[PDB]
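FAQ
Q: What does a multi-component entry look like?
A: The components come first, one per line:
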Amino acid sequence: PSVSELIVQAASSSKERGGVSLAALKKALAAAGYDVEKNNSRIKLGIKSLVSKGTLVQTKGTGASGSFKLNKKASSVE
DNA sequence: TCGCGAGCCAGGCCTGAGAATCCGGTGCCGAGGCCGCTCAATTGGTCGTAGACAGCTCTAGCACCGCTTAAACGCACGTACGCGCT
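Then the predicted structure of the entire assembly, as tokens:
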């Protein structure tokens, strides 16, 4: 499972009203068997790529350190 | 979700450059020794008194008891602040 796929799965899995933060996504990936320490840069890059592609809409914070949600709209505007 | 192309990061390899450090020799001036003296440390004596010892008086420091209740305590719960990470 690619980093972005696990990120999307965890984000759709969590039911936070305000979104899933960097710490929350790290905890989810760590619970998913992912090394959150050795691959931190990759997690951040995947998050940024998902934000840029419009897959994840950032709700709080700026950059990688904020919180993000699934965009249920861009999934059908391909 | 897989095949596969190619690029990015982790770490090892290896060397260069710069600096620390050991090795050698020269010289140079301050440490150690010696001589002269002189003054201060020693000895002996006297003498007066500072304090060591013995004794008594009597304060207060210790030990004990009981009653009261102020406070220490253990528990449970909540949150806000320290810590980690970016």
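Q: Is there any commentary attached?
A: Sometimes. For this entry: Residues 1, 5, 22-23, 26, 40-42, 44, 63-65 of chain A lie near DNA strand B (CB under 10 Å from a C1').
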